[PDB]
Amino acid sequence: ANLWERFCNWVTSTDNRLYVGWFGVIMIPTLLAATICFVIAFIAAPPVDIDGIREPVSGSLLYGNNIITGAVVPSSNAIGLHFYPIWEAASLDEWLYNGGPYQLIIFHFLLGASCYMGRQWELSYRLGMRPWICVAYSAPLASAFAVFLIYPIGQGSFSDGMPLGISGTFNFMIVFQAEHNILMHPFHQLGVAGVFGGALFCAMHGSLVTSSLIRETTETESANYGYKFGQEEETYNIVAAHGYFGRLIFQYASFNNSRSLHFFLAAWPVVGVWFAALGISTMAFNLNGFNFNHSVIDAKGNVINTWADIINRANLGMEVMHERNAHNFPLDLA
Amino acid sequence: KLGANVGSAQGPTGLGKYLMRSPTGEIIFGGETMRFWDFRGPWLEPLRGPNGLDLNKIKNDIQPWQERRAAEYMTHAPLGSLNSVGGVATEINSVNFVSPRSWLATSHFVLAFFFLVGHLWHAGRARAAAAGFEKGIDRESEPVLSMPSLD
Amino acid sequence: IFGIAFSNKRWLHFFMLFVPVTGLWMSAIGVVGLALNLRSYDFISQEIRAAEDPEFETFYTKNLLLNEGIRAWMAPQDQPHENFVFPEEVLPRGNAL
Amino acid sequence: MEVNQLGLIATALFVLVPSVFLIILYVQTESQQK
């Protein structure tokens, strides 16, 4: 075998402790670059003029932040969607002032994570598995793309992408609510049903299986020793779990088929999160949450407030305060 | 019109209130719209010179039709609610408007995304079926069982 | 793929109970503190620095300005029994908006 | 920055005390007769 064949065999080998593969060939360097840049920046990067108004925001630990307040800060509004690699800057000091690290990190990360998805497909193929775990991973991946790439594209600037930090994430959410009324958007609502529902069904399934574990141990040992890795028989009694849950609600509201049950466990959070992502991705082009401001009016024409109008007052507070030095004209149009 | 010198008017941040430079020096509009300096449109280009927006043309050559068009476009920005209330999220009901650019963009992002999902679904499945394990693992021939342990 | 994996099915399903159940319990504890206004509202070190240094800015201080907007703009209608009358000149607002 | 002066030892003992508890239990399990 020639060197190229040998190389291919190693790359695609099923015997490596961590699978490499062709997607991995792109994934490994890209993720390494984003990770190393992120760590260095989070610790040591100087303040970044996020909104392009010569008002630098400090994100790093050494420059006055803790874990909660710290972030890698989005690139400058003056840059917009322009590509800003290191080599476009006159110097590293310039690169840092303008938020170059943010772009390096999000681009390497989105590429690497896309490749992580591909790699899940690939290993599934090498092992003779069915292929759709990667489809499940498309839901969180799409969500990352929405907040790091699609929202910036729609708004015209990477300065409006989600910051790489805890408090910065909260900032992104609050401004998003001011600008799009996301809580009143049905795709975010489906998202919430997706994650609340996912947590519910996680707990529910965990609890039902745990409840029907077949006795294999004594009281003085963990019941977990009753399962042995790779044993052929199922470790809990699905018939009993179904008898239970079926009587909790009614018979036909409970799954008796383990396959349908597990498909449901996959599909409910995945679909809901797909809609969460599509929410952000469509509010990116300013198709916003439902607007019922002054929808209810009395016989004379007096406005009768509903809870929607209280939401509106909250959103106004957010709107009038955000980026307090960046607007010169009355309408915030992106 | 009120008498401001728009070239020399310094905004609260130190950047020009109306006019500033792009990162490569071109004269562009200020405020948040600094992000949109790549914009080009027939109502704006006549005020454009070699170095970007031209202060002399701005002072002397702006026509009523340009004022009209800029007013029209400013008040038909592609922002609006799902129930077609025009304007920012905090705007009151009155104007029935969501830009066709928004309808078209949003619909086609949704469709393109689900079509990528469909590509993954059918590509993975086609691979599995061509290889012969799309229905599951052969219990008597489970490939992982013939592989050396990872550790 | 990920470096680690479940090998015990019983532990796997127990963990599925543990994670969301414990999360919800933790949120409940925080809300009990909020019943008393015992908030995690501030970082004191942040506030001392920002008070002294008008060039010091983080996402933390940026979010507090948003909170202040919410309070002033929502309170009069959300808390009608207080009979708040906040004249226009006292409302917190950035430039133009 | 004017941090709380007890924060350092609070964090240190928060990490050390339960970590050590776990290490003790693990090592004495390993040394039990196979």
């Binding site: 803790n66 874990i67 890795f229 | - | 680690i4 | -």
Partner: peptide, 30 residues
């Protein structure tokens, strides 16, 4: 000292990842 503490905890976490992956108790089919 705060920065040192944060970065130390993070570093310990990364080390833990390393041991958890490469020095795990190997899964064994009985």
């Amino acid at each position: 000292m705060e920065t040192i503490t944060y970065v130390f905890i993070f570093a310990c976490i990364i080390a833990l990842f390393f041991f958890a992956i490469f020095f795990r108790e190997p899964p064994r089919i009985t």
